[PDB]
Amino acid sequence: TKASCKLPVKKATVVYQGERVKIQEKFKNGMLHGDKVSFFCKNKEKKCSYTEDAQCIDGTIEVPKCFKEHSSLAFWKTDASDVKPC
């Protein structure tokens, strides 16, 4: 009775099983229920980036607010997906 999720982004990069990929591609057909993937983010307090593990649920998933599909005022020149881990 485990359904699948739906890539909430068309170009999101997460770390599934310690591997960096694009949920919009690897899971182009939605993500499997329970699938755990971390998103890349940055810490203005530590000046480093890290990962936010996520969990796919029966047809529903809650991506970490950290991720920002909207750039608007991203500024800087190193999105979390391309930052060094603290």
Swiss-Prot record:
The chain holds residues 260 to 345 of 345 of the full protein. Residues 4-86 are annotated as: Sushi-like. Binds to various kinds of negatively charged substances such as heparin, phospholipids, and dextran sulfate. May prevent activation of the intrinsic blood coagulation cascade by binding to phospholipids on the surface of damaged cells. Expressed by the liver and secreted in plasma. Disulfide bonds join 5-56, 41-66, 48-86. It is found in: Secreted. This is Beta-2-glycoprotein 1. N- and O-glycosylated. PubMed:6587378 also reports glycosylation on 'Asn-188' for their allele.
